[PDB]
């Protein structure tokens, strides 16, 4: 009951899915062949981890996941990789030629050739659910598939699954590791098209994660493997309430009630701690007070923005590991003085706390050290609009000369779709200003 289906779209979404499902297996004790020796109910059950893993008669625990990419290169690595036995072939869907960094090809030209097959496979996962809760969609903003095909899919999911909840883990583009010059275009187009079809979207700025790896893990030039393993820790913290259970385990939908005050204001800011190397972890243990304090350091945010320049509409602390409420309340009491945390006047100022006792784990051989306690903060701050603003400014620079627009128009799009999408962003920026203004 309360199953969640994960959908990984494009290279970024697929490769992040690999990190998450590898980490899930390590957290739950699932082997690469899907066997789970601790699970005494063979062939089924309603344990908390069954929200993400179905069970076969032979005792294999199968991710409730679909991988989709318009090119086979990336998913072929899943097919021949370490966890190849974890998935059935029907969950790994590949095209022939990709969207070539073009939203129009991901949403229209190439996308319409595979959308029905993808929905058919999603439907086969939903039919195995006793009470499907919703979807988690992993994708990039910048890719032609991560943007164009995700928009088409979210639109089709609204039709085939009503207002069933759809959550996003979206990769915000950064020049340090970017693929295409037209990434601002694909980002605005998909944010506009998906806006009314997404209940909640956790953005991840590749530059934020990139700088966290350089600074905290001492990686000269981080790779996608470095970034995705860190990203998987945030995703694990967010879904741990669904996958695990406990007396102080607060469900994510309960946080979601506090995080989304208006339908369009559904982009929470994520901050994770501690991210430390094995060398530093060998020296010092980080307390509840220390990792909580790190949640309000802007260097630990998933998205580059200045929360001091905005106002808070929600603040959630998701703890995992060796953590008890007495420590949390004391640490929050400290933070509520040394740090100035301004709320909008129409919202209560308390912090919502959840604790998952299952200790965090790391991929063996990785760079993240295994710590005894971690925390993920989910806050709704108007400051996250700064990320939209930077992206909108790059869009405006290119669109003023219509640079590269012919690649989109040649695939059937119109200039109106660009201006309509940009206006939605301007209205969203205006929305974030309005919510932060004090009442009369």
């Amino acid at each position: 009951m309360r199953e969640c289906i994960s959908i990984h779209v494009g290279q970024a979404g697929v490769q992040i899915g690999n990190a998450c499902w590898e980490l899930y297996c390590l957290e739950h004790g699932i082997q690469p062949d899907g066997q789970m020796p601790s699970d005494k109910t063979i062939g089924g059950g309603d344990d908390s981890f069954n929200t993400f893993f179905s069970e076969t008669g032979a005792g294999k625990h199968v991710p409730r996941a679909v991988f989709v990419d318009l090119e086979p290169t990336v998913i072929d690595e899943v097919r021949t990789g370490t966890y190849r036995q974890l998935f059935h072939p029907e969950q790994l869907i590949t095209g022939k030629e990709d969207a070539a960094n073009n939203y129009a090809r991901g949403h229209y030209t190439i996308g319409k050739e595979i959308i029905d097959l993808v929905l058919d496979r999603i439907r086969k996962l939903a039919d195995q659910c006793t009470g499907l809760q919703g979807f988690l969609v992993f994708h990039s903003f910048g890719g032609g598939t991560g943007s164009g095909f995700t928009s088409l899919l979210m639109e089709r999911l609204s039709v085939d699954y009503g207002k069933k909840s759809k959550l996003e883990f979206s990769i915000y583009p950064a020049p340090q590791v970017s693929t295409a010059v037209v990434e601002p275009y694909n980002s605005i187009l998909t944010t506009h098209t998906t806006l009314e079809h997404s209940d909640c979207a956790f953005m991840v700025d590749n530059e934020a994660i990139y700088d966290i790896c350089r600074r905290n893990l001492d990686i000269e030039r981080p790779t996608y493997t470095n970034l995705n393993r860190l990203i998987s820790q945030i995703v694990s913290s967010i879904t741990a309430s669904l996958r695990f259970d406990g007396a102080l385990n607060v469900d994510l939908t309960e946080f979601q009630t506090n995080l989304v005050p208006y339908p369009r204001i559904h982009f929470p800011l994520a901050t994770y701690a501690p991210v430390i190397s094995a060398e530093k972890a060998y020296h010092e243990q980080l307390s509840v007070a220390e990792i909580t304090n790190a949640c309000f350091e802007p260097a630990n945010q998933m998205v580059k923005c200045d929360p001091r320049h905005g106002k808070y509409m929600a603040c959630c602390l998701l703890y995992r590991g060796d953590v008890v409420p007495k420590d949390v309340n004391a640490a929050i009491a400290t933070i509520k003085t040394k740090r100035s945390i301004q709320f909008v006047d129409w919202c209560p100022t308390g912090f919502k706390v959840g604790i998952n006792y299952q200790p965090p784990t790391v991929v063996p051989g990785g760079d993240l050290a295994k710590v005894q306690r971690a925390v993920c903060m989910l806050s709704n701050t108007t400051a996250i609009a700064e990320a939209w603003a930077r992206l909108d400014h790059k869009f405006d620079l290119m669109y003023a000369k219509r640079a590269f627009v012919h690649w989109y128009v040649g695939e059937g799009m119109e200039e109106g779709e660009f201006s309509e999408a940009r206006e939605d962003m301007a209205a969203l920026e205006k929305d974030y200003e309005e919510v932060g203004v004090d009442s009369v």
């Binding site: 290169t73 022939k96 030629e97 070539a100 960094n101 073009n102 020049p175 340090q176 970017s178 693929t179 295409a180 010059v181 037209v182 601002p184 000269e220 030039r221 790059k394 620079l397 290119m398 003023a400 000369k401 219509r402 640079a403 590269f404 012919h406 690649w407």
Partner: protein, 421 residues
């Protein structure tokens, strides 16, 4: 995976195309008998982009050799790797174009164009996922210039949703074969503007100047010029031939390099001709450009840079970021993050480190001004027009192609002077 069909037409086309297939077969470890004898699995990961696999695990280049006279293609079949080519892919003419565009585009070439299309159709019909077409030719001759541009248009009719990529050779009086070369080039440039997605401008003036000023020769042969072309053609296709994320196929390269459809003529550059800073600085130097243009006389719309070899990829990021900041005024502001950097751990033969520069600069107008000035000085007197009007052409086709080229230069100047803020 993603197959590219290669076509070479005329003297210059089949010559540089031969060296290209010689170089990359050496890089992928393929002998003249079409057998693999390499050490790295990266040589075969994307080998099918340029090669077919036949009986006995032989790798045959997906190349079609075209010419209106057999003399040039005969020495190709007799040269090294002449056995590696499919003998049926040789399409042979017996008349020649006489270095005349009208003969290549309308008369001699049009009689042979159908037989080329049949061979191209067979290579494309057995492709898992065709990328498009890669042409090597010259613009100053008759076959490669006239029939090449004709072959482009006829292929576009049958594959309108495929990428058309060409390696065009620009004529200069420093290595001039004939005197009517400004006529053939202007007519061909008019065709390349409308029917190709991306064109690498291989300027013989820049080749000779390098083979004279930098590499001291005074008497540079075609082999020394083509040696620069092979290293350049090997560099600009490294992203297509090895496992890479940036500009891995023709359409992604065109999407990231071409901001406006007509402005698709690139400035190739190569270095060296010892360290990552030195390698980066030479790569942007005007004296390392394979086109006779100075980028400090224009603006960069888009740039792609490929570092080959083993080096500090962190030092590469710091050096490519340093040159963008120090030379900020030479990059258009209204295109953010318009310089991409690729790294391939496999160096070319004979070099521990190399760098390949592909720039879309408005300074390319200097090359088009040079060809147009030689055209008008020759067209002001209606010189040698009987070669073309004898083949049925009208003076309208000459004046249009010239008017088309003058519009291209003014389009580059329009975006050179365009600002934001």
């Amino acid at each position: 995976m993603r197959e590219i069909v290669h076509i070479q037409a005329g003297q210059c086309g089949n010559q540089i195309g031969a060296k290209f297939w010689e170089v990359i077969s050496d890089e992928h470890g393929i002998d003249p008998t079409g057998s693999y004898h390499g050490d790295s699995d990266l040589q075969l990961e994307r080998i099918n982009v340029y090669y077919n696999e036949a009986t006995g695990n032989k790798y045959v280049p997906r190349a079609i050799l075209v010419d209106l006279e057999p003399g040039t293609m005969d020495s190709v079949r007799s040269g090294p790797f002449g056995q590696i080519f499919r003998p049926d892919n040789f399409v042979f003419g017996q008349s020649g174009a006489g270095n005349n565009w009208a003969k290549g585009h309308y008369t001699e070439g049009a009689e042979l164009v159908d037989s080329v299309l049949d061979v191209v159709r067979k290579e494309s019909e057995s492709c898992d996922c065709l990328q498009g077409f890669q042409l090597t030719h010259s613009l100053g001759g008759g076959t490669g210039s006239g029939m090449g541009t004709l072959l482009i248009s006829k292929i576009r009719e049958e594959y309108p949703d495929r990428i058309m990529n060409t390696f065009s050779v620009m004529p200069s009086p420093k290595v001039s074969d004939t005197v009517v070369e400004p006529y053939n080039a202007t007519l061909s440039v008019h065709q390349l503007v409308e029917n190709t997605d991306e064109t690498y401008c291989i300027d013989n003036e820049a080749l000779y100047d390098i083979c004279f000023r930098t590499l001291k020769l005074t008497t540079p042969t075609y082999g020394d010029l083509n040696h620069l072309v092979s290293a350049t053609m090997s560099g600009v296709t490294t992203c297509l031939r090895f496992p890479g994320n940036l500009n891995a196929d023709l359409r992604k390269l065109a999407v990231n390099m071409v901001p406006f459809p007509r402005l698709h003529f690139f400035m190739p550059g190569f270095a060296p001709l010892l360290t990552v800073p030195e390698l980066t600085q030479q790569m942007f130097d005007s004296k390392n450009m394979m086109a006779a243009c100075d980028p400090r006389h224009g603006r960069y719309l888009t740039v792609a840079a490929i570092f080959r070899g083993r080096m500090s990829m962190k030092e590469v990021d710091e050096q490519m970021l340093n040159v963008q900041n120090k030379n900020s005024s030479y990059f258009v502001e209204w295109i953010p993050n318009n310089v991409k950097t690729a790294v391939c751990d496999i160096p070319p033969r004979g070099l521990k480190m190399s760098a390949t520069f592909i720039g879309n600069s408005t300074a390319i107008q200097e090359l088009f001004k040079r060809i147009s000035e030689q055209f008008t000085a020759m067209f002001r007197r209606k010189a040698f027009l009987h070669w073309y009007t004898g083949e049925g052409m009208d003076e309208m086709e000459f004046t249009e192609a010239e008017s088309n080229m003058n519009d291209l230069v003014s389009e580059y100047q329009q975006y050179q002077d365009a600002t934001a803020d």
